[PDB]
Design a protein around this ligand. Structure first.
Ligand SMILES: [Ca+2]
Length: 281
């Protein structure tokens, strides 16, 4: 039996699945620890490793890239879970080594790979505390080329009056995603600041794990995965929308929650976003 994780229901993805919008032919890059291509509930289309010591992007040692991938696109069948965009073309972009660490060059190389390979959506479920001209240049180039760029806001919680949003979520060109729970309350670990754009489910998120397993993780990575999947649903309905239009559709149709510093525009609603982009007209 297949179970629909509550977070996929919470953002109203099943309403679009029932209309035949499932993210078909939309290319989504998961820039993370790789994706297990052997999992019966995931269809990996391609990808690349940017880790010099670890040449196989389909060997997921850290487990979380396979989990993010399942939130984006776990297949619609009789097993496992169900992704937000179960027909999406999933690409594994491994930028973290078996030890948990990732040089900034590897992440930027992964973004450049994604532009060269014409990804429609890039999900970056990683943050750093610091940016660089090259990291900003890569995400700005990706958005200039038409890519929807989504990133986890970070898991740094509240710090005084400061922004704790990580990079590259902190850059204006990137959609920064925080985490709520099933009650729509902000998760205590979710990073905060004026750079936050939207929230999505990020606690107790059931998804695919390597070796034909399933389990729950928590984090703004999980939240970002929902929004990346939602962008793919939107592009399956509206293939000629610009990335600016897809971004506005998600931001302008949220369920309003608390203050923008903690919640951004609120919780995404992909059913409402798919009605109209609300960019200018
Ligand atoms: Ca399934």
């Amino acid at each position: 039996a297949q179970s629909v994780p509550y977070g996929v229901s919470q953002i109203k993805a099943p309403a679009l699945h029932s209309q035949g919008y499932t993210g078909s032919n939309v290319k989504v890059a998961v820039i993370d620890s790789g994706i297990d291509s052997s999992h019966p509930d995931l269809k990996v289309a391609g990808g690349a490793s940017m880790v010099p010591s670890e040449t196989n992007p389909f060997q997921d040692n850290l487990l979380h890239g396979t989990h993010v991938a399942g939130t984006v696109a776990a297949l619609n069948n009789s097993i496992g879970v169900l992704g937000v965009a179960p027909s999406a073309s999933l690409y594994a972009v491994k930028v973290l080594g078996a030890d948990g660490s990732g040089q900034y060059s590897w992440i930027i190389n992964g973004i450049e790979w994604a532009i060269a390979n014409n990804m429609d959506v890039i999900n970056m479920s990683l943050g750093g505390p610091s940016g660089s001209a090259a990291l900003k240049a890569a995400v700005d180039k990706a958005v200039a080329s038409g890519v929807v760029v989504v990133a986890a806001a970070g898991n740094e919680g509240t710090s005084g009056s400061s922004s704790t949003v990580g990079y590259p979520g902190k850059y204006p060109s990137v959609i920064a995603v925080g985490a709520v729970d099933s009650s729509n309350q902000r998760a205590s670990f979710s990073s905060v600041g004026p750079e936050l754009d939207v929230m999505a489910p990020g606690v107790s998120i059931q998804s695919t794990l390597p070796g034909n397993k399933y389990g729950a993780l928590f984090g703004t990575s999980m939240a970002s995965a929902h929004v990346a999947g939602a962008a793919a649903l939107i592009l399956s309905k509206h293939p000629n929308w610009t990335n600016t239009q897809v971004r506005s559709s998600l931001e302008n149709t949220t369920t309003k929650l608390g203050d923008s510093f903690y919640y951004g525009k609120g919780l995404i609603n992909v059913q409402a976003a798919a009605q109209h982009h609300h960019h200018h007209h």
